[PDB]
Every structure is written in C-alpha cells, then in structure tokens.
Amino acid sequence: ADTLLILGDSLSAGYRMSASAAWPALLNDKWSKTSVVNASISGDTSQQGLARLPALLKQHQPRWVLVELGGNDGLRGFQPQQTEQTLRQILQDVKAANAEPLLMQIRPPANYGRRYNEAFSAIYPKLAKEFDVPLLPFFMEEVYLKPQWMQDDGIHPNRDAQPFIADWMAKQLQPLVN
Numbered sequence: 001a002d003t004l005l006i007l008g009d010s011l012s013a014g015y016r017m018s019a020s021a022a023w024p025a026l027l028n029d030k031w032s033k034t035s036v037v038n039a040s041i042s043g044d045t046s047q048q049g050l051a052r053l054p055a056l057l058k059q060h061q062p063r064w065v066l067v068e069l070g071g072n073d074g075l076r077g078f079q080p081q082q083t084e085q086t087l088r089q090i091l092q093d094v095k096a097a098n099a100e101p102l103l104m105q106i107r108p109p110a111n112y113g114r115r116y117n118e119a120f121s122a123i124y125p126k127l128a129k130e131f132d133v134p135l136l137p138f139f140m141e142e143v144y145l146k147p148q149w150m151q152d153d154g155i156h157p158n159r160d161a162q163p164f165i166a167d168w169m170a171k172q173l174q175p176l177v178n
C-alpha cells in the first residue's frame with residue numbers, strides 16, 4: 001500500500017537497457033506489498049535530481065525515498081561542497097514531505113584524485129549523521145568484484161547483474177521498510 005520512491009541516475013535507471021530490465025523493476029515485481037516507483041534518469045546529477053523531486057513528492061507521496069545521486073557531479077564541474085549542499089536540500093524536501101529519506105553511499109572512480117575522492121565520499125556519512133537517516137552501502141562495491149556483471153565501460157552494471165542487485169537491495173531495504 002505504501003510507496004518507495006527511487007531518486008537516482010543510471011545506476012538505478014539502468015544503462016543502455018530498458019527500465020523494465022533495471023533492478024528497481026525486478027524489485028517491484030518481487031514486492032503488491034510495497035510499490036517501487038523508479039524516478040531515475042541516466043546522467044542525472046544531484047542537482048538535476050533535486051529539480052525533479054518536488055513534483056515527484058507531491059505526485060507519489062512516498063513513505064520512503066531512496067536517494068542515489070552524486071556519481072555524475074564530479075564529471076559535471078561540481079565540487080564536494082556543491083554536491084553536499086544539493087543532497088542536503090534533497091533530504092530536507094523528503095523530510096518536509098513527511099517521508100523517510102534513505103541515502104546511499106556513492107564512491108567515485110579510483111582514478112579521480114584522492115583529494116576529491118575522500119572529500120566526495122565523506123559527504124554521505126556527514127549528511128546521514130546530520131539528518132540521522134539510514135546510510136546504505138554503495139551496492140556497486142559488490143558488483144565490481146564480478147567482472148561478468150560489468151559493462152565494457154567498467155562503470156555501469158549489465159543486464160545479468162540486475163537480478164542480483166535486486167535481491168541485494170531487497171535485503172538492505174527489508175528492515176527499513178518494515
């Protein structure tokens with residue numbers, strides 16, 4: 001009866017595959033118990049996601065909102081401060097909508113500069129603490145350990161990987177959606 005809104009990028013929308021092939025669709029099929037609305041768009045930055053949020057909240061009135069954004073910010077001329085501030089507004093909107101925000105940790109490519117990487121990654125733990133919300137692990141950490149689940153670009157998970165990502169997310173979300 002309740003709805004879980006997913007606000008993410010290609011990792012949740014699916015890269016070079018249809019939405020129906022993406023793990024959130026498989027998760028929804030696994031759950032008439034809880035409705036999963038996948039509001040993810042490939043290439044979206046935290047800012048682009050924030051821009052769509054207001055309409056989505058008033059439209060779907062979700063109980064929980066999974067935030068999976070930031071991974072594109074670095075390649076789009078953004079500084080950790082900008083990303084942090086953008087995600088901060090996202091969490092604010094969610095709470096202000098009487099919904100529980102579920103933040104996912106994001107980690108940039110190993111080759112993006114320690115200076116930025118450690119600063120970027122630190123944004124999530126900080127925000128999770130600041131708002132006192134669940135901080136889910138970056139699901140891609142488990143996917144990297146299986147080349148057969150990665151597309152050529154070595155960045156996006158493939159079709160074969162979605163079913164596993166779906167079960168993994170179900171387990172992570174289970175205690176959070178009661």
Ligand SMILES: CCCCCCCC(=O)O
Nearest residue numbers: 009010042043071108109
């Ligand atoms: C190395 C992890 C960061 C990549 C996030 C993918 C972003 C997108 O395509 O929409």
